[PDB]
């Protein structure tokens, strides 16, 4: 496996819940860079070297995801909830001496990003999350269309083991399908080819595949009740986060994204690129400029 | 290997325009036909249709697709498997015996089949039993989390192929008996007998069977829908008399009551609860025929 981050560091940040893996490059503060599914850190490898010119990038592959430790689940999937998840990120953070950081999140990484911002936001300096609503938007935004258009959220949270029973027969063809199907493009041509192995691989490990489900299930449970919490009781995000979304991705397809986070954040900017789900693959000089803007503000 | 489960059915192979419908057919009496539904085959109704057949010249019939029917070539639209296609098709089987006025009960995707056929074409029912749903567009109407949870496969079987059926090939075997189990009152495979479980597990063996089940739910979330749809906006009830059988632990039940959304759609409906999962005939066979009975003598 290629390593796309010439000249990073690598750290294996070690936590109560697991190590954390991460490639650590630049210099000045601290910014912390989360993938999600089905990827890993690598990729924000067209931006991060971008970003590493003015910040210190930490580019760590989630709890259960890439390289990093799979803390055991239960019956709540209570480790791979964003709020467990963003606890250990704070952890692995705070063995790096950054108790007050920049974050970025993409996908399930954006999930655990504003869910650490509602928890934990005196640990945020800036705060942006890459083609997402909050969890529990999708889940009320749940109609016919959007059943269809993101029907892996029902799916892979079905119960242990139908999901994973059936990624085993061809754990390749649905990464490469779920990769594929949100590109802009409908197919693998915005991915370095070498980016891709390391997702497939990812996706090759029967256990990477059950922590991705336990992912979808917490975000279909407790994923779902936290931020039902916050949605009904007002909590805000109160650090400044810029939302960025792809015009052909996943966020626009139920809702006009701004609208939607100026609910949840106080101080919420957003820009749309032109662009599927995977902005920092598929866009990532209009997606490096628009981060660096916004963490040197 | 597969075990005959309806003894003194004979079986028939009724032509239509889209291929053959495979039927057990029993009794003597008006015509009724019964129609399964997903992932099952007409066995499905192997414990209720002999209780049926002692008042009612019974047909069980693989829809369209499924079993041992043929399967129609599908489309761009999925069209042979939409269920005003499958209503078409089985009016046409049905014409090949003489019955061009039935009784029609079906359960699941059958279930569908029989209410699209009851709206397109009421005067060839005389009466029409559904067991254990709602409306294809009720369903796609309550989409919600908790729904969209419960009937998970609504979507994931209606995504573009070859995606369910390259997931569905992952494991098929277990698949069909946690579909069957899942939506059980007990939850595991204890409701029914082992010998239509290796009917449902050898035709869902089958990849091209697989296909079509999948056509079937692509069909149920696109053309099924928009016919739905139609009927909701021009007012048209059906007006065969109708009953609306559900499981209490099945998927039509929710918090509203089934009976009351089958109210928006039929003039004339009785409906009851019965104590079961999804698989009323299977798992409550004896309260599901005089149920059935009951209704189909009025
Ligand atoms: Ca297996």
Not at 36 to 47: E, I, S
């Amino acid at each position: 496996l290629a390593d796309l981050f010439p000249g990073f560091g690598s750290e294996w940040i070690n936590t109560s819940s697991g190590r954390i893996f991460a490639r650590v490059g630049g210099d000045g503060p601290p910014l912390l860079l989360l993938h999600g599914f089905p990827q890993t850190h690598v990729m924000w490898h067209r931006v991060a070297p971008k970003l590493a010119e003015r910040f210190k990038v930490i580019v760590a592959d989630l709890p259960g995801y890439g390289w990093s430790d799979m803390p055991e689940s239960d019956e709540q999937h209570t480790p791979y909830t964003k709020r467990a998840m963003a606890k250990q990120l704070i952890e692995a953070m705070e063995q790096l001496g950054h108790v007050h950081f920049a974050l970025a999140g993409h996908d399930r990484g954006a999930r655990v990003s504003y869910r650490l911002a509602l928890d934990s936001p005196g640990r945020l300096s800036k705060l942006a999350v890459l083609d997402i609503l909050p969890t529990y938007e999708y889940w009320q935004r749940m109609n016919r269309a959007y059943a269809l258009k993101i029907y892996h959220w029902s799916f892979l949270a079905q119960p242990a083991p139908l999901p994973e029973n059936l990624l085993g027969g061809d754990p390749d063809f649905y990464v490469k399908a779920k990769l594929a199907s949100w590109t802009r493009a409908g197919d693998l041509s915005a991915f370095d080819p070498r980016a891709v192995e390391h997702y497939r691989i990812a996706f090759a490990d029967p256990m990477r595949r059950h922590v991705m489900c336990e992912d979808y299930r917490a975000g279909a449970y407790a994923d779902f009740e936290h931020d039902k919490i916050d949605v009904e009781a007002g909590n805000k995000i109160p650090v400044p986060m810029l939302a960025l979304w792809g015009a052909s991705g996943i966020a626009q397809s139920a809702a006009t994204p701004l609208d939607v986070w100026r609910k949840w954040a106080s101080d919420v900017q957003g820009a749309p690129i032109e662009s599927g789900h995977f902005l920092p693959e598929e866009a990532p000089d209009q997606t490096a400029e628009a981060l660096v803007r916004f963490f040197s503000a």
